[PDB]
Design a protein around this ligand. Structure first.
Ligand code: NDP
Ligand code: NDP
Ligand code: K
Ligand code: K
Ligand code: ZN
Ligand code: ZN
Lengths: 332, 332
């Protein structure tokens, strides 16, 4: 069984179409989940809750009256609403106020690792006028999440070839081509439609996940690396507000380089990815990202263990190989 | 808006999931539309109506009570139910009993030309046990409807290039790769999962249409050719039981060859397509299809006029060109 969105809207002023969509879906009493910084975009009568409240106290019969959940804001607002909808057995509507990650339209819940699959949101309502004005850092981070499809798909193919893992060529090429087109737009344009093209790309990626019934087309080694970084932040109680997308971008730079070494046909791939990220002002080094080199290296060595998913990392990098990789790609 | 299916089920015994799916969609009063040969698969107590009977006297408050339409059967049952759902402003559930064309999951209504866009079905319930047993000719025809994505996409790229028509690389490559995968499966395997792979491909193709908001990834000059054939059958009152997919398959052979003349990198594409069609016993010649060579030639010369859609046919083939084309590809 494949669950996809029913409705997808990407346009200026889309936020005003919430009610139209609810009506189309025969829904009447949403619970809105949002953030403190995004509450200003919530202009309607519906009940509103902040994702903090929910998160501190998951478990509930408190939510009995709602026939759906609307997640408005950033990745965490969305992710939290998605999870909540799942727990309540009701549809989820995704209303991103930025373009920072591919959770927007994905069936993936990433509240706490390990992440799991639920239903894709029933609707995606992406107001590009709001998104255009979101903090630049979040838009830049979104690029990180998109370029990662490239290594995710490379890693998927690899897992197919070397471990006979189940693979779909048509899903993979869809996911990959989304990334390719955005890279090529970023490298050849004035960027005046970047926010638009980025949100379309992120939504496309979520659909790819749904259709493949797997995060494989959107998540591979580069994501393992990012999760490792997250683990280490928590562990060492580091105070670094690096974004998910940013970490994935840097991850992709390095993992694309590993794939390049083994396959001369991909010559210049890692450079092109790095360039695309620089062009939109996403970080490409550990220093810009806020991390000491030892954390990057530790994250690399542990990345293959984060999940049971074969990638170009294979059975793992040594500290020495990790250091080399990170040096050669300019991450440190 | 992009409107896509919500639920997609492709598996043995899927027909028994209708109740479950209706419940998930909070739908409770369907009208079932079916055919005389497929009524036997309607094992439920819903109201049932035959498409032919609805088709003659179309235009209605007879149906005010239903909250959805379920189309069960072949292309025409589905196409009729889809149309009806659209007229009533209610969701359509698609329940194919064969795999004969891409109307299964598409937002296209093709009752009579010109065909138009509506909503994608809200659910696709494809029982591969039923479909496996459908008349072999219909399964063979389905291949015709799949390979046509290749020329459709070639024609789309050409319209982008030459007329600046709106184009999506990621949708196009998805649609095209679906066809490639299935061709490759057909040429490499024992065909024991062909029905299953075919249904998945046809559904994928419908999703591609939805996502592109256009029939472009799935319908080009080859489909024009097929419509022209249909026009001529009606006009000369020919009694030829040729299927839509069959006609598209042969169309594809010829249109590929036109693309080949201008782009040598594609050379041999049309022969591979021909081979794939032969491997599943779809017709590849006018004689197998049931037509006289003059009808083929006339259809070719009129195809570009069937709709306002720029293709490799451009402003049209002369009868002499048409004959050469059909001769050079072995169609006549
Ligand atoms: N594999 C993974 O880990 C994935 C995880 N996710 C989920 O996404 C999260 C990351 O999301 P991300 O967006 O990167 O980070 P956050 O959701 O933490 O967002 C960062 C900040 O940006 C703010 N913000 C968002 N939009 C606007 C706007 N228009 N104007 C002003 N501020 C805005 C948010 O405000 P506020 O405080 O109001 O929220 C938040 O404070 C993860 O933690 C996870 O829950 C999603 C995809 C993949
Ligand atoms: N581009 C286009 O123009 C497109 C058009 N269409 C629409 O679809 C139609 C073509 O559909 P297609 O399926 O090729 O042709 P039809 O639906 O006309 O015919 C299929 C025939 O097979 C029978 N049948 C189907 N499944 C079974 C089964 N499991 N067992 C026994 N018999 C079965 C049907 O029965 P029954 O007689 O009971 O119906 C029908 O007689 C077109 O006429 C058009 O309306 C669809 C997609 C694209
Ligand atoms: K991604
Ligand atoms: K097609
Ligand atoms: Zn991600
Ligand atoms: Zn067709």
């Amino acid at each position: 069984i494949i669950v996809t969105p029913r409705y997808t809207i990407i346009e200026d002023g889309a936020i005003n179409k919430i009610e139209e969509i609810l009506k189309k879906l025969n829904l009447k009493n949403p619970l809105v989940i949002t953030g403190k910084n995004t509450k200003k975009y919530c202009r309607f009568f519906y009940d509103i809750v902040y994702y903090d409240e929910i998160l501190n106290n998951l478990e509930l019969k408190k939510y009995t009256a709602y026939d759906c959940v609307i997640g408005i804001g950033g990745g965490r607002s969305i992710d939290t609403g998605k999870y909540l909808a799942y727990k309540l057995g009701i549809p989820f509507i995704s209303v991103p106020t930025t373009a920072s990650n591919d959770g927007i339209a994905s069936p993936i819940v990433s509240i706490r690792q390990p992440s799991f699959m639920v239903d894709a949101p029933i609707a995606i309502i992406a107001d590009t006028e709001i998104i255009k004005k979101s903090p630049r850092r979040l838009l830049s981070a979104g690029m990180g999440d998109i370029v990662s499809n490239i290594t995710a798909v490379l890693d998927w193919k690899l897992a197919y070839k070397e471990k006979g893992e189940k693979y779909s060529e048509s899903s993979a090429i869809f996911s990959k081509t989304i990334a390719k087109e955005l890279i090529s737009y970023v490298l050849n344009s004035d960027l005046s439609e970047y926010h638009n093209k980025l949100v379309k790309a992120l939504v496309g990626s979520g659909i790819a996940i749904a259709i493949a019934n797997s995060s494989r087309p959107a998540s591979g080694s580069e994501h393992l690396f990012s999760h490792a970084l997250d683990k280490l932040k928590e562990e060492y109680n580091l105070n670094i507000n690096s974004l998910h997308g940013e970490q994935c971008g840097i991850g992709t730079i390095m993992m694309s380089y590993l794939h390049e070494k083994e396959n001369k046909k991909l010559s210049g791939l890692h450079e092109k990815i790095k360039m695309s990220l620089k062009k939109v002002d996403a970080p490409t080094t550990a220093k810009e990202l806020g991390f000491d080199e030892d954390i990057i290296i530790e994250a690399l060595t542990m990345a293959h263990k984060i999940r049971n998913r074969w990638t170009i990392l294979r059975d793992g990098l040594s500290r020495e190989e990790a250091r080399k990789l990170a040096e050669e790609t300019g991450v440190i």
